[PDB]
Motif scaffolding. Structure first.
Motif, PDB file in Angstrom:
ATOM      1  N   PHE A 162       3.371  23.412  48.753  1.00 21.98           N
ATOM      2  CA  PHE A 162       3.666  23.207  47.328  1.00 21.98           C
ATOM      3  C   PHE A 162       3.323  21.780  46.896  1.00 21.98           C
ATOM      4  O   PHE A 162       2.505  21.588  45.992  1.00 21.98           O
ATOM      5  CB  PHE A 162       5.139  23.588  47.075  1.00 21.98           C
ATOM      6  CG  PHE A 162       5.693  23.171  45.722  1.00 21.98           C
ATOM      7  CD1 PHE A 162       4.908  23.198  44.568  1.00 21.98           C
ATOM      8  CD2 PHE A 162       7.046  22.829  45.600  1.00 21.98           C
ATOM      9  CE1 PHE A 162       5.430  22.819  43.334  1.00 21.98           C
ATOM     10  CE2 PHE A 162       7.589  22.453  44.349  1.00 21.98           C
ATOM     11  CZ  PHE A 162       6.770  22.460  43.214  1.00 21.98           C
ATOM     12  N   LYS A 163       3.912  20.788  47.558  1.00 24.29           N
ATOM     13  CA  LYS A 163       3.651  19.399  47.201  1.00 24.29           C
ATOM     14  C   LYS A 163       3.406  18.588  48.454  1.00 24.29           C
ATOM     15  O   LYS A 163       3.970  18.878  49.519  1.00 24.29           O
ATOM     16  CB  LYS A 163       4.817  18.785  46.408  1.00 24.29           C
ATOM     17  CG  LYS A 163       5.009  19.437  45.044  1.00 24.29           C
ATOM     18  CD  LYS A 163       5.758  18.567  44.064  1.00 24.29           C
ATOM     19  CE  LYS A 163       7.215  18.441  44.379  1.00 24.29           C
ATOM     20  NZ  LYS A 163       7.894  17.711  43.257  1.00 24.29           N
ATOM     21  N   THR A 164       2.568  17.560  48.327  1.00 15.59           N
ATOM     22  CA  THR A 164       2.301  16.665  49.441  1.00 15.59           C
ATOM     23  C   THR A 164       1.974  15.266  48.941  1.00 15.59           C
ATOM     24  O   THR A 164       1.506  15.085  47.797  1.00 15.59           O
ATOM     25  CB  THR A 164       1.152  17.191  50.304  1.00 15.59           C
ATOM     26  OG1 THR A 164       0.898  16.270  51.368  1.00 15.59           O
ATOM     27  CG2 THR A 164      -0.116  17.382  49.485  1.00 15.59           C
ATOM     28  N   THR A 165       2.192  14.281  49.805  1.00 20.76           N
ATOM     29  CA  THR A 165       1.691  12.925  49.540  1.00 20.76           C
ATOM     30  C   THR A 165       0.175  12.806  49.768  1.00 20.76           C
ATOM     31  O   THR A 165      -0.440  11.791  49.398  1.00 20.76           O
ATOM     32  CB  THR A 165       2.403  11.880  50.412  1.00 20.76           C
ATOM     33  OG1 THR A 165       2.341  12.307  51.778  1.00 20.76           O
ATOM     34  CG2 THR A 165       3.840  11.733  49.983  1.00 20.76           C
ATOM     35  N   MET A 170      11.734  17.558  58.768  1.00 21.34           N
ATOM     36  CA  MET A 170      12.682  16.661  58.116  1.00 21.34           C
ATOM     37  C   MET A 170      13.862  17.449  57.566  1.00 21.34           C
ATOM     38  O   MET A 170      15.011  17.055  57.749  1.00 21.34           O
ATOM     39  CB  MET A 170      11.971  15.881  57.025  1.00 21.34           C
ATOM     40  CG  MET A 170      10.712  15.208  57.566  1.00 21.34           C
ATOM     41  SD  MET A 170      10.959  13.908  58.978  1.00 21.34           S
ATOM     42  CE  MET A 170      12.077  12.655  58.007  1.00 21.34           C
ATOM     43  N   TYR A 171      13.576  18.553  56.883  1.00 27.15           N
ATOM     44  CA  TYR A 171      14.621  19.498  56.491  1.00 27.15           C
ATOM     45  C   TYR A 171      13.993  20.867  56.323  1.00 27.15           C
ATOM     46  O   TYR A 171      12.949  20.994  55.703  1.00 27.15           O
ATOM     47  CB  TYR A 171      15.343  19.109  55.184  1.00 27.15           C
ATOM     48  CG  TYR A 171      16.276  20.228  54.775  1.00 27.15           C
ATOM     49  CD1 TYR A 171      17.561  20.337  55.312  1.00 27.15           C
ATOM     50  CD2 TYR A 171      15.826  21.248  53.932  1.00 27.15           C
ATOM     51  CE1 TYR A 171      18.387  21.418  54.987  1.00 27.15           C
ATOM     52  CE2 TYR A 171      16.633  22.318  53.594  1.00 27.15           C
ATOM     53  CZ  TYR A 171      17.915  22.404  54.121  1.00 27.15           C
ATOM     54  OH  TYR A 171      18.707  23.483  53.773  1.00 27.15           O
ATOM     55  N   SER A 172      14.645  21.893  56.856  1.00 25.42           N
ATOM     56  CA  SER A 172      14.263  23.272  56.574  1.00 25.42           C
ATOM     57  C   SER A 172      15.509  24.117  56.434  1.00 25.42           C
ATOM     58  O   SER A 172      16.506  23.877  57.142  1.00 25.42           O
ATOM     59  CB  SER A 172      13.361  23.827  57.666  1.00 25.42           C
ATOM     60  OG  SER A 172      13.086  25.204  57.448  1.00 25.42           O
ATOM     61  N   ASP A 173      15.457  25.104  55.538  1.00 22.80           N
ATOM     62  CA  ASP A 173      16.547  26.079  55.461  1.00 22.80           C
ATOM     63  C   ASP A 173      16.261  27.344  56.254  1.00 22.80           C
ATOM     64  O   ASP A 173      17.114  28.239  56.314  1.00 22.80           O
ATOM     65  CB  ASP A 173      16.948  26.383  54.015  1.00 22.80           C
ATOM     66  CG  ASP A 173      15.893  27.152  53.231  1.00 22.80           C
ATOM     67  OD1 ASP A 173      14.789  27.421  53.760  1.00 22.80           O
ATOM     68  OD2 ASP A 173      16.192  27.454  52.046  1.00 22.80           O
ATOM     69  N   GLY A 174      15.075  27.428  56.868  1.00 25.30           N
ATOM     70  CA  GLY A 174      14.708  28.607  57.641  1.00 25.30           C
ATOM     71  C   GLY A 174      14.446  29.863  56.819  1.00 25.30           C
ATOM     72  O   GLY A 174      14.234  30.939  57.394  1.00 25.30           O
ATOM     73  N   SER A 175      14.416  29.729  55.485  1.00 28.93           N
ATOM     74  CA  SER A 175      14.403  30.883  54.571  1.00 28.93           C
ATOM     75  C   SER A 175      13.414  30.739  53.433  1.00 28.93           C
ATOM     76  O   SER A 175      12.696  31.681  53.102  1.00 28.93           O
ATOM     77  CB  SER A 175      15.798  31.097  53.927  1.00 28.93           C
ATOM     78  OG  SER A 175      16.836  31.215  54.887  1.00 28.93           O
ATOM     79  N   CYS A 186      12.126  27.153  52.234  1.00 33.56           N
ATOM     80  CA  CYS A 186      11.354  25.918  52.117  1.00 33.56           C
ATOM     81  C   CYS A 186      11.496  25.019  53.345  1.00 33.56           C
ATOM     82  O   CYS A 186      12.476  25.122  54.097  1.00 33.56           O
ATOM     83  CB  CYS A 186      11.741  25.151  50.848  1.00 33.56           C
ATOM     84  SG  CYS A 186      13.504  24.806  50.683  1.00 33.56           S
ATOM     85  N   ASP A 187      10.493  24.159  53.542  1.00 35.65           N
ATOM     86  CA  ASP A 187      10.491  23.158  54.605  1.00 35.65           C
ATOM     87  C   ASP A 187       9.968  21.849  54.060  1.00 35.65           C
ATOM     88  O   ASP A 187       9.044  21.839  53.249  1.00 35.65           O
ATOM     89  CB  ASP A 187       9.532  23.535  55.747  1.00 35.65           C
ATOM     90  CG  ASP A 187       9.575  25.000  56.105  1.00 35.65           C
ATOM     91  OD1 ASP A 187      10.558  25.459  56.714  1.00 35.65           O
ATOM     92  OD2 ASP A 187       8.607  25.694  55.783  1.00 35.65           O
ATOM     93  N   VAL A 188      10.532  20.755  54.542  1.00 33.64           N
ATOM     94  CA  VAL A 188       9.953  19.441  54.337  1.00 33.64           C
ATOM     95  C   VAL A 188       9.579  18.915  55.705  1.00 33.64           C
ATOM     96  O   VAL A 188      10.447  18.812  56.581  1.00 33.64           O
ATOM     97  CB  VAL A 188      10.941  18.461  53.640  1.00 33.64           C
ATOM     98  CG1 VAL A 188      10.293  17.098  53.428  1.00 33.64           C
ATOM     99  CG2 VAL A 188      11.426  19.055  52.318  1.00 33.64           C
ATOM    100  N   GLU A 237       5.278  16.646  53.317  1.00 31.89           N
ATOM    101  CA  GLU A 237       4.858  17.929  52.771  1.00 31.89           C
ATOM    102  C   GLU A 237       6.053  18.797  52.475  1.00 31.89           C
ATOM    103  O   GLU A 237       6.970  18.902  53.293  1.00 31.89           O
ATOM    104  CB  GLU A 237       3.995  18.676  53.794  1.00 31.89           C
ATOM    105  CG  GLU A 237       2.705  17.958  54.155  1.00 31.89           C
ATOM    106  CD  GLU A 237       1.904  18.684  55.222  1.00 31.89           C
ATOM    107  OE1 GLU A 237       2.475  19.562  55.926  1.00 31.89           O
ATOM    108  OE2 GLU A 237       0.695  18.346  55.363  1.00 31.89           O
ATOM    109  N   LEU A 238       6.028  19.429  51.307  1.00 30.58           N
ATOM    110  CA  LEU A 238       7.052  20.412  50.913  1.00 30.58           C
ATOM    111  C   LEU A 238       6.383  21.792  50.850  1.00 30.58           C
ATOM    112  O   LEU A 238       5.478  22.012  50.025  1.00 30.58           O
ATOM    113  CB  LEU A 238       7.622  20.038  49.540  1.00 30.58           C
ATOM    114  CG  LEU A 238       8.548  21.013  48.809  1.00 30.58           C
ATOM    115  CD1 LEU A 238       9.748  21.451  49.677  1.00 30.58           C
ATOM    116  CD2 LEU A 238       9.029  20.393  47.485  1.00 30.58           C
ATOM    117  N   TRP A 239       6.818  22.681  51.743  1.00 33.34           N
ATOM    118  CA  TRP A 239       6.289  24.039  51.859  1.00 33.34           C
ATOM    119  C   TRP A 239       7.308  25.021  51.294  1.00 33.34           C
ATOM    120  O   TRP A 239       8.517  24.829  51.472  1.00 33.34           O
ATOM    121  CB  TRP A 239       6.059  24.386  53.340  1.00 33.34           C
ATOM    122  CG  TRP A 239       4.972  23.556  53.996  1.00 33.34           C
ATOM    123  CD1 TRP A 239       5.066  22.254  54.441  1.00 33.34           C
ATOM    124  CD2 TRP A 239       3.626  23.987  54.290  1.00 33.34           C
ATOM    125  NE1 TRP A 239       3.850  21.853  54.968  1.00 33.34           N
ATOM    126  CE2 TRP A 239       2.959  22.896  54.901  1.00 33.34           C
ATOM    127  CE3 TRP A 239       2.922  25.187  54.089  1.00 33.34           C
ATOM    128  CZ2 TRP A 239       1.620  22.970  55.319  1.00 33.34           C
ATOM    129  CZ3 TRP A 239       1.580  25.253  54.497  1.00 33.34           C
ATOM    130  CH2 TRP A 239       0.953  24.148  55.105  1.00 33.34           C
TER     131      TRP A 239
END
Length: 144
Positions: A21-24, A83-88, A90-92, A100-102
């Motif tokens: 979705f978003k990235t540096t 860095m953070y994921s909810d497993g459902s 999204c992931d950072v 990166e935000l997936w």
């Protein structure tokens, strides 16, 4: 905002896939995605199909073995630290000094209402670096 493990991030809901979705990172191709299959929970290995917008409005597809090393998802030489994921939904992750935000394929019609833990972690970790938006609604569906 306690993160899930790197394996739980890789596997996600076990269906669908994830779009970047978003990235540096600048110059990323639209519709960058990854999709896991053939999940082996004991070994923490999977097949990843990955790619982005190609020619003829079709996704590119390449495969690789995905695995876990520490808190990183490993694909070839790429070690994406969770860095953070909810497993459902999204992931950072951090990869090659990029943040990166997936987002899961189920979350693509609510890009403004993502898990607060994901957006907070992305916004914190990107610092003063400009963000780039890689997903668009007209991206094709995940390969099957």
């Amino acid at each position: 905002c306690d993160t899930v493990s790197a394996w739980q991030s890789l596997r996600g809901p076990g269906t669908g896939g994830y779009y970047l979705f978003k990235t540096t990172e600048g110059g990323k191709t639209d519709c960058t995605y990854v999709k896991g299959s053939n999940f082996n929970d004991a070994a923490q290995t999977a097949t990843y199909t990955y790619g982005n917008m190609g020619s003829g409005n079709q996704m590119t597809q390449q495969t690789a073995s995905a695995s876990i090393s520490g808190n990183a998802i490993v694909v070839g030489t790429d070690h994406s630290e969770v860095m953070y994921s909810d497993g459902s939904t999204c992931d950072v992750v951090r990869l090659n000094g990029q943040i990166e935000l997936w987002i899961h394929s189920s979350a693509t019609s609510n890009t403004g209402n993502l898990n607060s833990c994901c957006t907070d972690k992305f916004n914190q970790e990107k610092g003063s670096r400009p963000e780039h938006v890689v997903y668009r609604s007209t991206c094709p569906n995940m390969p099957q």
